[PDB]
Amino acid sequence: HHHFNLPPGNYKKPVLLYCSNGGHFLRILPDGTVDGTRDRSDQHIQLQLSAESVGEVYIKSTETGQYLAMDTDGLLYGSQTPNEEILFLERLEENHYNTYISKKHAEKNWFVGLKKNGSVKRGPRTHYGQKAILFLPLPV
């Protein structure tokens, strides 16, 4: 269903997922809520990515140990259980950025995206070409 241009991949140590269009850090709040903040000093924006298989990764918060996940409705949420919804297809974009496609919802092109206001974009609304789907893993 999708191209296989992978990013150099950085799973060695925790990182911050910085989003282009709005300029936020993907944040997984303790209550399971997902959104974004320009607070680089927020202890909930630090995430540890690990490769499930080639091109496939997990996104876990090092602070609370929650997994980023997308539900059957296209809404992102924090998960404390490793279900089939925590899998994301990690892919290079515009040659320099990273994008994440819900593995379970890959055939529908549901990416991980943050709006300029810092709220998460529901899957169906995201799509190729939006700055909302661009991320860049910056050091912690």
Curated annotation (Swiss-Prot):
Gene3D superfamilies: 2.80.10.50. In the nucleus, phosphorylated by PKC/PRKCD. GO terms for molecular function: fibroblast growth factor receptor binding; growth factor activity; heparin binding; integrin binding; S100 protein binding. InterPro entries: Fibroblast_GF_fam, IL1/FGF. Changing K115E: Reduced integrin-binding. Defective in integrin-, heparin- and FGFR1-binding, and defective in inducing FGF1 signaling, cell proliferation and cell migration. A motif (Nuclear localization signal) lies at residues 12-15. Changing K121E: Loss of CSNK2A-, CSNK2B- and LRRC59-binding. Reduced integrin-binding. Defective in integrin-, heparin- and FGFR1-binding, and defective in inducing FGF1 signaling, cell proliferation and cell migration. Changing S102A: Decrease in LRRC59-binding. One of its GO terms (cellular component) is extracellular region. Changing K116E: Reduced integrin-binding. Defective in integrin-, heparin- and FGFR1-binding, and defective in inducing FGF1 signaling, cell proliferation and cell migration. Residues 115-131 are annotated as: Heparin-binding. Changing R122E: Reduced integrin-binding. Defective in integrin-, heparin- and FGFR1-binding, and defective in inducing FGF1 signaling, cell proliferation and cell migration. PANTHER family: FIBROBLAST GROWTH FACTOR (PTHR11486). Belongs to the heparin-binding growth factors family. Plays an important role in the regulation of cell survival, cell division, angiogenesis, cell differentiation and cell migration. Functions as a potent mitogen in vitro. Acts as a ligand for FGFR1 and integrins. Binds to FGFR1 in the presence of heparin leading to FGFR1 dimerization and activation via sequential autophosphorylation on tyrosine residues which act as docking sites for interacting proteins, leading to the activation of several signaling cascades. Binds to integrin ITGAV:ITGB3. This is Fibroblast growth factor 1.
